[PDB]
Design a protein around this ligand. Structure first.
Ligand SMILES: Cc1cc(C(N)=O)cc(C)c1-c1[nH]c(C)c2c1CCCCC2=O
Ligand SMILES: [Cl-]
Length: 121
């Protein structure tokens, strides 16, 4: 069915991000002490990781395909907010964001978004 099909696609896409070069930095939430960033959660108020998205997909927490996109984009927006533009972490986020947005085209995922936008118009 409709929702099962884009859930399957979303799981495929999130897994490709996890395997992308340097994608491990987005897998788990930042540990303020262990990653030497004591101020992280003072700056980042809506934290998000690949593993959070996988949990929402596993549990059935998304109702619309755009909710998946919003959460993944939030990871990259957190990245560019906290990290300085030239840094290894900021580079990695820009790389994976670019990859992610291309995958939404290549997999047809955006077409589920287009179909769902007309439904809830
Ligand atoms: C670089 C890094 C390495 C590992 C690891 N297990 O090696 C784990 C994490 C969570 C991270 C990481 N990821 C992000 C999105 C961030 C960090 C910490 C540095 C700056 C703050 C920051 O934004
Ligand atoms: Cl690393």
């Amino acid at each position: 069915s409709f929702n099962k099909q884009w859930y399957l696609l979303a799981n495929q896409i999130i897994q490709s991000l996890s395997k992308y070069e340097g994608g491990h930095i987005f897998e788990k939430l930042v540990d303020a002490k262990k990653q030497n960033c004591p101020d992280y959660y003072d700056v980042i108020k809506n934290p998000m990781s690949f593993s959070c998205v996988k949990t929402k997909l596993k549990k059935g927490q998304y109702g619309l395909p755009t909710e998946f996109i919003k959460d993944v984009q939030l990871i990259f927006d957190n990245c560019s907010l906290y990290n300085t533009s030239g840094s290894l972490v900021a580079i990695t986020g820009k790389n994976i964001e670019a990859y992610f947005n291309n995958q939404l085209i290549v997999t047809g995922y955006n077409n589920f978004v287009t179909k769902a936008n007309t439904i809830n118009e």
